[PDB]
Design a protein around this nucleic acid. Structure first.
Ligand SMILES: [Mg+2]
Ligand SMILES: [Mg+2]
Length: 185
RNA sequence: GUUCUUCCGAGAACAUAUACUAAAAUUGGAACAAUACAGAGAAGAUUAGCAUGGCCCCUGCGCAAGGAUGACACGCAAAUUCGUGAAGCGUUCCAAAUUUU
């Protein structure tokens, strides 16, 4: 967007590629419109709008029914789960969920819990620490790591830390990263 | 006033205090007749009665018997006095998802 404001037809460019279109950022929304305007005029320049989300081909219309290419490719399959009734206090549920997983799941792995913000990610750390201090020696060590966009560098760097070597009884120790949408994308 | 005295115009005896004192003038207290109008004790109703009480009477010779069982009684039915533990308070809140030039 900064280049176009000096050179409206993007004169240096032959093939554009507007990646990650799903994120729909103010930079991107402006671009797309001007770039469709460019697709008039500079009638030699290719445009390849990529999106990583499956989105309902609204992009396909917008650009004069341009051809849509679908490419699959995840790495592993994921299991999805729901609560059958609707819990009325989600943080009490989330905290309770973390403990439940820590105790019952036999597979090694870390827990990534999505909360709304620092008023909660700093509460959820504390309260989850309380119940693991209650569960004592049998349960594996759970390490609770907050993660939000304004943590200083040293506090962010924790997330790279590996789990304990687990307790001797075979109880799986785990890292629990509690994070806003910074862990989403 | 009437009977006696006489020197004669006075004397003596008898007789002794009635009457809400009115032909009045004033000033009160009871019961009558009845216009339009409704219903007179007893835990639904139809209804004998006998009591109880007292600054309420009437008829009755009356300690008999009657008057709506004479009437009234008919609710705010409030009268010697407390003992317990919680909670506001003594004046006082509420908070940053991601991120780009
Ligand atoms: Mg009766
Ligand atoms: Mg009678």
């Amino acid at each position: 967007l900064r280049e176009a404001m000096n050179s409206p037809l993007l004169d240096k460019y032959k093939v554009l590629i507007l990646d990650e279109a799903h994120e729909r950022t103010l930079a991107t929304d402006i671009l797309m419109g001007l770039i469709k305007e460019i697709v008039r005029n500079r009638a030699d320049i290719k445009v390849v709008i990529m999106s990583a989300t499956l989105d309902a081909g609204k992009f396909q219309r917008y650009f004069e029914d341009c051809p849509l290419l679908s490419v699959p490719g995840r790495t592993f399959p994921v299991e999805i789960f729901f609560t059958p009734n609707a819990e009325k206090d989600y943080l009490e549920a989330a905290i309770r969920t973390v403990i439940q997983i820590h105790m019952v799941e036999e597979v090694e792995g870390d827990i990534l819990l999505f909360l709304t913000g620092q008023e909660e990610i700093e509460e959820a750390c504390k309260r989850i620490d309380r119940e693991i201090q209650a569960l004592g020696a049998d349960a594996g060590a759970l390490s609770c790591i907050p993660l939000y966009s304004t943590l200083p560098p040293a506090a962010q760097q924790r997330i790279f830390e590996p789990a304990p070597p687990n307790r001797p009884n075979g109880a799986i120790s785990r890292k629990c990263v509690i994070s806003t949408n910074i862990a989403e994308t």
